[PDB]
């Protein structure tokens, strides 16, 4: 970045060929940014506003009748209850704006409303970097609310929660969500491997659910080769293939026998899907890192909900972005602040699986989303 | 064997009691009361047989033998 | 200690039930009932403590040494 007090000397009035600075800021004082309202439009996809729940309450024993007799009595029947909680983080931030009463009088106008729509901007980039890094960062957090410690949890990342038996099958301690494919390039395996991770939990297409994965270009494009009995990488052979969109650009149908998979529409949540494999959707992500791939439920029955909660301040005067108003002022020096608070946490720790290419080892979180990073 | 002329009815009778007071599932008073011990009761009662002993077939898959009758609904034990 | 602005209440608090329908001395209609034999029950249910601990001094009157709970106020040795 670049920072300190603004200062006369760094007003600029004209350009070499005479035109006005004020006419070049106006062009940045008042204009939404498009990467930054695609950013904003992430975060409002995969966050909830935090509200207080129990877990799902386990469901009680169930009773039988007994023989009877003419002269005894029957034997006595009873049943009990359990529950649980969890929390979310919760973190301060601000920003400062000082100059010099010198600044202020010579600047245009334009300067400092192009500084305020930045700041409107910084705060995007925040929030942002926060919701995923709750996703991305595998690692367990401790919280202090009201004096007391809380542990807020990433998707299952081979602790000792124990997932809830879904049908009949019951998991052990040490289950995962923080998957590495054992191989450079990513494969139809993987793909399968990944999607019924998420689909053992419940979370399957006859509960109503879509699932979607989030990747980049690079594995993208490994993806859309994807086709029926064939090899692809790591020779792994596709039990599916994959249908492209109604929206891309037009390809010949391989075979009389037509392809396995219903065409995907043209897009999901205002988001252009490039095709299906399996019965996932598989959405182009310009935030998302290389090696890497998210997979994610949406709706039926058990995701309603979306996978990231945020928690703000338990009063309105605390919430949202808020200006102070600083405290050097007027002469000769003029200060202000920007600042916002909120944290984050994940509730539904098995409604989506972080997957990376990579040949071998344990997971890396990805630099950009680890949690001591930074702010951007 | 269901519907046409000589499968026109289910394959299992229910008998229950004879006097509307005994049918249904019923609760009873129990007969300890207040103080310090306190008990009730349901009662339930009927059974079953068939008439039409032609009327279906059980098979089993297994690789030789005699017939076994399934542990879940074998008479002698259990009540679910 | 009694009256003035810390003795507005005094040394021992008697503690009963939330509910009306325990509070108070309570007759309970016992459990043999008419013939050979009849039985009933009185019941009450209530408890102690003191909030004002330096609201009070016992005083024991002996020569010297440890001093003794009197046994007519055990608790547990007797009831009444």
């Given at each position: 970045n670049?920072?300190?007090?603004?200062?006369?000397?760094?007003?600029k009035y004209k350009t070499a060929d005479g035109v006005s600075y004020d006419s070049l800021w106006n062009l940045f004082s008042n204009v939404t940014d498009e990467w930054n309202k695609h950013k904003s439009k992430m975060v409002q996809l995969m966050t909830f506003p935090v509200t207080n729940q129990t877990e799902k309450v386990p469901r009680i024993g169930q009773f039988g009748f007994e023989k009877a007799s003419e002269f005894g009595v029957p034997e006595s029947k009873r049943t009990e209850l359990s529950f649980y909680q969890l929390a979310y983080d919760f973190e301060d931030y601000d920003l400062a704006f000082r100059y010099t009463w010198k600044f202020l009088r010579d600047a245009p106008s334009s300067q400092i409303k192009a500084?305020?729509?930045q700041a409107l901007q910084a705060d995007a980039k925040l929030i942002h970097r926060k919701?995923?890094?709750?996703?991305?960062?595998?690692?367990?957090?401790?919280?202090?609310?009201?004096?007391?410690?809380?542990?807020?949890?990433?998707?299952?990342?081979?602790?000792?929660?124990?997932?809830?038996?879904?049908?009949?099958?019951?998991?052990s301690?040490?289950?995962?969500?923080?998957?590495?494919?054992?191989?450079?390039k990513i494969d139809s395996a993987d793909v399968e491997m990944a999607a019924d991770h998420i689909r053992e939990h419940g979370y399957t297409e006859?509960?109503?659910?879509?699932?979607i994965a989030f990747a980049h270009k690079a594995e993208i494009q490994e993806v859309r080769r994807f086709?029926?009995?064939?090899?692809?990488?790591n020779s792994a052979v596709a039990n599916y293939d994959f249908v492209q969109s109604q929206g891309e650009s037009p390809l010949y149908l391989p075979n009389?026998?037509?392809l396995l998979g219903k065409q995907p529409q043209s897009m999901w949540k205002g988001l252009r899907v490039k095709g299906s494999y399996d019965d996932v959707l598989w959405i182009e992500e310009p935030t998302m890192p290389a090696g890497y791939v998210l997979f994610l439920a949406t709706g039926g029955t058990l995701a309603q909900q979306n996978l990231v909660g945020l928690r703000e301040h338990e009063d309105a005067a605390w919430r949202g972005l808020r200006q102070i108003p600083g405290?050097?002022?007027?002469?000769?020096?003029?200060?202000?602040?920007?600042?916002?608070?909120?944290?984050?946490?994940?509730?539904q720790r098995g409604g989506a699986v972080v997957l990376q290419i990579k040949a071998s080892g344990t997971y890396d979180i990805p630099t950009k989303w680890t949690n001591g990073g930074g702010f951007e």
């Open positions: 670049q920072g300190g007090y603004n200062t006369a000397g760094d007003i500084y305020h729509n919701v995923m890094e709750a996703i991305f960062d595998n690692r367990e957090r401790e919280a202090d609310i009201e004096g007391l410690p809380y542990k807020v949890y990433p998707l299952y990342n081979g602790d000792n929660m124990i997932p809830p038996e879904y049908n009949g099958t019951t998991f301690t040490g289950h995962n969500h923080y998957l590495v494919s054992g191989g450079t006859e509960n109503g659910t879509q699932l086709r029926f009995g064939q090899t692809n990488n009389a026998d037509g405290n050097q002022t007027r002469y000769p020096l003029i200060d202000s602040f920007y600042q916002r608070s909120f944290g984050t946490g994940i509730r």
